[PDB]
Design an enzyme around this catalytic site. Structure first.
Site, PDB file in Angstrom:
ATOM      1  N   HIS A  68      48.337  44.098  43.011  1.00 23.93           N
ATOM      2  CA  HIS A  68      47.695  43.115  43.923  1.00 23.93           C
ATOM      3  C   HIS A  68      46.214  42.925  43.575  1.00 23.93           C
ATOM      4  CE1 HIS A  68      51.387  43.826  46.249  1.00 23.93           C
ATOM      5  NE2 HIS A  68      51.240  42.525  46.480  1.00 23.93           N
ATOM      6  N   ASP A 107      45.738  36.921  48.261  1.00 21.04           N
ATOM      7  CA  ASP A 107      45.816  38.412  48.371  1.00 21.04           C
ATOM      8  C   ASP A 107      44.404  39.038  48.365  1.00 21.04           C
ATOM      9  OD1 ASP A 107      48.521  39.289  48.806  1.00 21.04           O
ATOM     10  OD2 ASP A 107      48.993  39.113  46.649  1.00 21.04           O
TER      11      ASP A 107
HETATM   12 MG   LIG Z   1      50.374  39.160  49.740  1.00 23.00          MG
HETATM   13 ZN   LIG Z   2      50.678  37.985  46.151  1.00 20.66          ZN
END
Ligand SMILES: [Mg+2]
Ligand SMILES: [Zn+2]
Ligand SMILES: COc1ncc(C2CC2)nc1C(=O)N[C@@H]1CCN(c2ccc(Cl)cn2)C1
Length: 313
Positions: A68, A107
């Site tokens: 991420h 994110d």
């Molecule tokens: Mg996410």
């Molecule tokens: Zn993502």
């Protein structure tokens, strides 16, 4: 105004393809993103001084986690570019502006933990946002960065266009919460089959953009096998760390997240491909036929995982 970004010939050709990998040179990712904005949106959409400053504040606010991370942001933004370029006339000027930014920001400030682990840990964010915890945080972080002096890439929009773009970005980021995907796709399935799907209906567009966001977010499963296989390691590195932290809270984690149960991963990928990825790209293909290459690559990779299980790798 007349300052374009250009790429080397191999990237210039491969970047138009769904299965493009942005490569291991971090310092090229900002130029790749501005390249995509200029071709998707125009060289006029954003003041370049402000885009570059916004892009670099977003990079700063992604953390050094295995999956991420900044690379995921730019990867997800590239898949959305491929969808928008393969579906030229179906999207408004504001939607193309908003969705590339939504993907780059989707994110922001991810720590590598699911909404589940935040709730079991009793993290402050879980008191502030009861559902879609991280996703409400990511949209929050997006607004914060837009409000830094010199960072407002939307400044030239009219008041109402500005409110439209921030609403597009909020729904798009909330949609990346996979717990909301299942219901969204089942409704888009019913609507396509009963023939009621209507793209002039705002609530239908909203749903269709949601499924695009899920499709871009999972686009690791639509790359060439060697990319898909190596990303899986990064994905599992987060899962296992989260599983470790569950054990510290005195909770046996689901075997997907348990680093003692690595044997069970190829079967975990089957589950995930059949239950989530294949249905996602199927419904997407039915609604936006030019996105078929994503469904084809995803089936190719399902079959590669089947091969791992049969011991043929
Ligand atoms: Mg996410
Ligand atoms: Zn993502
Ligand atoms: C085995 O899981 C995965 N493998 C590969 C990739 C690649 C696309 C990056 N992503 C995942 C994933 O997102 N799994 C997530 C964990 C299990 N899945 C899930 C199911 C239901 C609900 Cl409510 C929430 N989560 C999604």
């Amino acid at each position: 105004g007349l300052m374009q970004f250009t790429l080397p010939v191999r990237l210039c050709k491969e970047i138009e393809l769904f299965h493009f990998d942005i490569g291991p040179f971090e310092n090229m990712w900002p130029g790749i993103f501005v390249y995509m904005v200029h071709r998707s949106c125009g060289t006029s959409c954003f003041e370049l001084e402000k885009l570059c400053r916004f892009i670099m504040s977003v990079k700063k606010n992604y953390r050094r986690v295995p999956y991420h991370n900044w690379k995921h942001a730019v990867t997800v933004a590239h898949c959305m570019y491929a969808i928008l370029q393969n579906n030229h006339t179906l999207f408004t000027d504001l939607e193309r502006k908003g969705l590339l930014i939504a993907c780059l920001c989707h994110d922001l400030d991810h720590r590598g933990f699911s909404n589940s682990y935040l709730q079991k840990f009793d993290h402050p964010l879980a008191a502030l946002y009861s559902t879609s915890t991280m996703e409400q945080h990511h949209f929050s972080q997006t607004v914060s960065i837009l409000q830094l002096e010199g960072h407002n890439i939307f400044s030239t929009l009219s008041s109402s266009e500005y409110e439209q773009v921030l609403e597009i970005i909020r729904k798009a980021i909330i949609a990346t919460d996979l717990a909301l995907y299942f219901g969204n796709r089942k409704q888009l399935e019913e609507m396509y089959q009963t023939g009621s799907l209507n793209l002039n209906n705002q609530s239908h567009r909203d749903r269709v953009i949601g499924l695009m966001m899920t499709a871009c977010d999972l686009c690791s499963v639509t790359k060439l096998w060697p990319v898909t296989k190596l990303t899986a390691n990064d994905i599992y590195a987060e899962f296992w760390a989260e599983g470790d932290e569950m054990k510290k809270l005195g909770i046996q984690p689901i075997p997907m997240m348990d680093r003692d149960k690595k044997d069970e991963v190829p079967q975990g990928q089957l589950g995930f491909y059949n239950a989530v990825a294949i249905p996602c790209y199927t419904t997407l293909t039915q609604i936006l036929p030019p996105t078929e290459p994503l469904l084809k690559a995803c089936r190719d990779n399902l079959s590669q995982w089947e091969k791992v299980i049969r011991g043929e790798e």
